[PDB]
From a paper:
Contiguous to the substrate-binding pocket, a triad of residues, Asp181–Tyr194–Lys198, form a hydrogen-bond network which has been reported to be crucial for the catalytic process.
We determined the crystal structure of LmPTR1 in complex with folate at 1.81 Å resolution in the orthorhombic space group P212121. The PTR1 macromolecule shows the characteristic homotetramer with 222 point-group symmetry and can be directly compared with all of the available structures reported in the literature. All of the functional groups of the FOL pteridine core participate in hydrogen-bonding interactions with the enzyme. The FOL amino group at position 2 is hydrogen-bonded to the Ser111 side-chain hydroxyl (2.8–2.9 Å), the carbonyl at position 4 of the FOL molecule is able to establish water-mediated interactions with the side chain of Arg17, and the N atom at position 8 is within hydrogen-bonding distance of the hydroxyl group of Tyr194 of the catalytic triad (2.7–2.8 Å). The terminal glutamate (Glu) tail of folate has been modeled in multiple conformations: in one conformation the Glu tail is oriented towards the β4–α4 loop, while in the other conformation it is placed towards the β6–α7 loop.
Residue numbers in the entry:
A (entry chain B): 5 to 73, 81 to 120, 133 to 288
B (entry chain D): 5 to 72, 82 to 119, 134 to 230, 240 to 288
C (entry chain C): 6 to 73, 81 to 120, 135 to 230, 240 to 288
D (entry chain A): 5 to 73, 81 to 120, 134 to 288
Amino acid sequence: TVPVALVTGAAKRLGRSIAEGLHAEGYAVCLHYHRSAAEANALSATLNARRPNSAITVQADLSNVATAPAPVTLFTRCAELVAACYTHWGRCDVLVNNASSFYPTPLLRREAMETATADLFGSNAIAPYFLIKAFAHRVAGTPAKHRGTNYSIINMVDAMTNQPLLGYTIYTMAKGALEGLTRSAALELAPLQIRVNGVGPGLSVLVDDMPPAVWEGHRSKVPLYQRDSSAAEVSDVVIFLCSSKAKYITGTCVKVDGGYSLTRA
Amino acid sequence: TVPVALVTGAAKRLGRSIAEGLHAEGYAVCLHYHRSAAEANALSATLNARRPNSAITVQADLSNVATAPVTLFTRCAELVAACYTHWGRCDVLVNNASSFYPTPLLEAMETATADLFGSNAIAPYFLIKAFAHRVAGTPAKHRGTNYSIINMVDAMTNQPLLGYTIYTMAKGALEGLTRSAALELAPLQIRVNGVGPGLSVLVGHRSKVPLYQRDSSAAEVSDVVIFLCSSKAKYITGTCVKVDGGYSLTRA
Amino acid sequence: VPVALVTGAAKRLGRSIAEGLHAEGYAVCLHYHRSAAEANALSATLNARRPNSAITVQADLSNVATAPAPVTLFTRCAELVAACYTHWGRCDVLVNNASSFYPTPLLRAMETATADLFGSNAIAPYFLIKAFAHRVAGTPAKHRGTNYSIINMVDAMTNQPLLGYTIYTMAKGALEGLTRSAALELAPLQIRVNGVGPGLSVLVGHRSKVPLYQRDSSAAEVSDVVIFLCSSKAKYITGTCVKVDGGYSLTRA
Amino acid sequence: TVPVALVTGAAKRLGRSIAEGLHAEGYAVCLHYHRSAAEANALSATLNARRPNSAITVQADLSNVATAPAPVTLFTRCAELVAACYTHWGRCDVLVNNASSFYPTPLLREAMETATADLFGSNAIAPYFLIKAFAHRVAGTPAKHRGTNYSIINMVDAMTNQPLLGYTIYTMAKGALEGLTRSAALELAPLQIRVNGVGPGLSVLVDDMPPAVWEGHRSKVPLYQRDSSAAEVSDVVIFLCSSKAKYITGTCVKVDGGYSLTRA
Ligand SMILES: NC(=O)C1=CN([C@@H]2O[C@H](COP(=O)(O)OP(=O)(O)OC[C@H]3O[C@@H](n4cnc5c(N)ncnc54)[C@H](OP(=O)(O)O)[C@@H]3O)[C@@H](O)[C@H]2O)C=CC1
Ligand SMILES: NC(=O)C1=CN([C@@H]2O[C@H](COP(=O)(O)OP(=O)(O)OC[C@H]3O[C@@H](n4cnc5c(N)ncnc54)[C@H](OP(=O)(O)O)[C@@H]3O)[C@@H](O)[C@H]2O)C=CC1
Ligand SMILES: NC(=O)C1=CN([C@@H]2O[C@H](COP(=O)(O)OP(=O)(O)OC[C@H]3O[C@@H](n4cnc5c(N)ncnc54)[C@H](OP(=O)(O)O)[C@@H]3O)[C@@H](O)[C@H]2O)C=CC1
Ligand SMILES: NC(=O)C1=CN([C@@H]2O[C@H](COP(=O)(O)OP(=O)(O)OC[C@H]3O[C@@H](n4cnc5c(N)ncnc54)[C@H](OP(=O)(O)O)[C@@H]3O)[C@@H](O)[C@H]2O)C=CC1
Ligand SMILES: Nc1nc(=O)c2nc(CNc3ccc(C(=O)N[C@@H](CCC(=O)O)C(=O)O)cc3)cnc2[nH]1
Ligand SMILES: Nc1nc(=O)c2nc(CNc3ccc(C(=O)N[C@@H](CCC(=O)O)C(=O)O)cc3)cnc2[nH]1
Ligand SMILES: Nc1nc(=O)c2nc(CNc3ccc(C(=O)N[C@@H](CCC(=O)O)C(=O)O)cc3)cnc2[nH]1
Ligand SMILES: Nc1nc(=O)c2nc(CNc3ccc(C(=O)N[C@@H](CCC(=O)O)C(=O)O)cc3)cnc2[nH]1
């Protein structure tokens, strides 16, 4: 009783929605955040008000860089994130790799390039690798009698992977590595009954820092409804794949994109 | 309003689990069968004992062959028409009925072509077209709010079962139907998706399944079909969901 | 001198495939349905360059019976492959290129379209591959050729359906399934089976959307790829589809 | 006057066959290497004996680490590889991202961080900085003086959907390399730079194991029941670089004898 979910980047948008949907199914939730301390503490208050000691927050930079209090490597920051679930609640049944940087890295016209690469690949790919390693190590270190009955890892990927967004090469590479992680971890962790799946949004909760015609033009291209998704239209799929009814699904990436990946220029 | 689901090959195995699953969600279900009349009728009796007027059975050969002439198109149209005649609506279509047997490359090949392609591909196309036409012909204020078509595909499509070429071709066509009808029917808010089992309710290779080293139960597949029809899945369309316990991840 | 059977060979990509294969030394069997004049003019051209290097054979590849007991699509397909063995004693390459292509809208006569689009694009390739494979298996091992290749012309844009073309889109997906299934099952006979998928090629606006060059392709930009896949240098390639689309499948709306 | 190709990891096996195959078509080849200096210099001597001034060798660690000086970054090392082509021959027309470390990183059980940097560097990040450096030098060339057939080939993996057990970082990096292939092909199409992939299945399998075990692996390939020769892969790379392939971009060609069609 009281399964525990770890959701990275849980403070806002899709990750907040995922944490809420998991909390609504009875999970205690560990809300990871990087820079959004206010929103993460506000969400924690809301969920703890519904159920005392059902949400906590942990801060971590998931870029592939070392930090300071010897320097602290990304891998041990990820190990410590999983550790916060077992320390507080004695378990971790669900891990959602949701946190993600996303900005252009154009090929056509150096501290920027160096920090872009660690940031985008760490957050979207390498920290997921380390977190899965930490999550799976902990299941392995748990006596079988004490293991949970429904371990589930979700990687937030991208429905539009075969149709790249112009000028976003590092991001697209990182989401491709994340799909590779989904398949590889699914295979390798199957004997522990840890399922690993991907959920791929198309356009979801689209930021509108552009002229109104440009924003409406973007959304209008989604065949189903001619709009971007809501946060829940994505997070409800995450919550299903973690549910026990999804127990035979692993290594699978589910598009939640309104048909947008079906389109062509 | 009680929504209606048409499930083909509903009498046994996955199709029965899909009919039972939608019925537990509150659907009235049209149970299509070909030869399993006794089984279909017994399933209908069970579901109607639970909720009166919640199940009917209809029979039809979904092979691509003229019947006694009645064409496959006409038989598929009448199947959708059965739902509208009995309940005035059809909200969900599950294209589950499917013949499966070898057509090795190295009149019985023409019977196999019409049977394997009809059930797995050509009948689903007519059924989808009939479902779409009835929705379009319905005044927009009287339309339902959660239209959903599920095609039962094959998670192992990229890894062909040796000797099953026509079956594999037909399931590849059904994936093409999924994508094309999802695109074209999006303006009517009809979602079109696939669910692809791996090894399920085998009647060996099951020890090779990475997750649990067994074929799936019926519910482990039908529970997914039910979710994709749920309104929580209403932004998913044009997508095929593998339910294979990772079997498609394997190699020889 | 090896032999290629090319369906729908009279014009456009099929004619360029036949020309490309012929230029590598192949004798070519030029299949046609309605374009008898174009097929026979092409045959005249290739035979003038190399005597007895081309023939032509007519067949409706729709999944329908034709009159002389009615003749089924299966039989007409068997007779296309037999035409190569009768005339030249071999058939080393089969290019499944013939294809009907027109709308079959789901929204806003259909038995004919089903038989025609699914026949040419999927069921006839299935029957032709079976006939082609039977003839190789029936050939004594010492007398088989050393480079059997089957090429199915598919569609680069298959994951991105063209609005209103459901039957065509379904048929090309069946054809990709046939490519994978036939490649696995015919591998012991060393018969390779691959696909080539154009995007927009030799169109009769949308051109500007192609990332590479902002144009549809020429016929040779496709047929050269077919020709390489049939070459001995490509002998380890089977069961795979090669996109030749200028990057169009990378685009989104 | 003579087109120039930069082949990473050119000293042995597939990279050497790719170098030989492009050289046979008339390319001058820059042969990159990391540890195999003897093998690289032997190959360059062979190519130069066949055709004077048709090969050079360059060393670089393509791991995502800083190297010995102010430290030298991976990007800098990557730009200097491409610049070596322009310094010596004035041009760089083809890039083959072939260099690749390959060993397990099991999920269950400094050498952790160096393996990530090495597997992710060789297979994904160094490809990226090499593609950018290559693209930058083309963009900087006046259109009057640009080459007419720019081609980038990424060596991917036909078995990407069917992961090798215990090889998670490798599998991830190749998945990233496929993303690079698609993204670079779209962004560099305006400069007529094509970007494609070639994915071997089992090629030139090392036989440092029991014979029965090596024959057992090989026998799983449906076509010929063997791993491929080096030329059976490199000939495809050379075709994709040819002008006959000039409408192909953004595409990954499996050269796997049907292995990806198999299941357990
Ligand atoms: N929304 C969409 O349209 C699409 C989304 N996706 C994927 O879905 C997931 C969520 O989408 P969305 O909710 O829009 O994602 P956001 O862009 O809102 O970012 C989510 C969180 O990622 C965290 N984050 C970013 N960089 C780092 C870092 N270097 N270290 C640690 N945390 C970091 C931030 O946490 P903080 O605020 O605490 O700094 C941010 O709140 C992502 O994986 C995204 O890639 C994929 C395709 C489309
Ligand atoms: N079970 C598995 O492991 C897998 C299943 N699938 C797919 O999932 C779906 C169901 O799986 P399963 O339950 O095993 O399927 P079955 O093989 O049990 O067949 C299901 C039903 O199809 C109907 N059917 C067959 N041919 C025709 C026809 N010509 N006309 C009309 N109805 C016909 C039969 O109805 P009747 O009995 O009334 O004649 C049969 O009961 C199918 O689409 C199948 O391809 C895909 C991959 C794996
Ligand atoms: N061109 C493009 O942009 C694209 C092409 N493709 C594929 O490339 C291949 C060739 O393309 P293209 O050259 O444009 O094809 P065409 O549309 O020109 O059709 C080629 C030939 O197919 C034959 N054909 C049509 N219906 C039948 C039938 N029922 N029975 C027998 N033969 C028939 C016709 O032969 P006749 O004239 O003798 O009647 C026609 O000349 C096709 O398979 C096509 O699907 C795929 C994607 C894009
Ligand atoms: N062979 C196969 O069966 C398959 C191969 N592939 C891909 O094809 C390509 C070639 O295959 P193969 O020839 O087997 O590859 P190899 O394993 O023989 O490695 C080729 C070269 O990579 C170079 N390399 C490795 N790590 C680094 C590094 N950190 N920095 C710089 N150079 C490095 C080495 O150069 P040096 O020796 O000079 O140090 C090595 O000779 C690779 O990309 C591989 O992933 C994909 C699937 C199957
Ligand atoms: N981490 C993450 N966060 C996101 O918000 C996100 N969004 C998408 C959805 N795709 C897009 C595409 C374009 C723009 C956008 O705002 N474009 C601006 C500037 C950048 C551009 O050139 O596209 C525009 O004006 O077009 C946003 C989201 C995909 N992955 C993500 N990943
Ligand atoms: N329509 C359909 N029915 C199924 O039962 C089915 N099963 C699978 C799962 N794959 C397989 C693969 C091999 C065998 C098999 O070995 N069959 C036995 C007899 C059972 C049979 O063929 O139905 C055999 O003797 O070959 C069964 C299922 C995939 N698609 C299906 N499709
Ligand atoms: N068998 C086959 N033949 C083809 O020509 C073909 N072409 C494509 C390329 N895609 C397309 C998409 C749209 C139109 C189209 O709508 N044609 C216009 C042309 C009218 C004009 O000349 O302006 C039309 O409406 O007829 C053609 C090709 C794909 N598969 C094919 N398959
Ligand atoms: N860079 C690279 N080099 C390769 O040789 C290579 N080979 C493959 C072909 N796949 C495989 C699969 C398994 C084994 C294997 O069994 N190796 C042993 C150790 C032997 C060794 O790699 O030196 C193993 O323990 O996995 C080798 C190659 C795929 N990618 C590659 N990538």
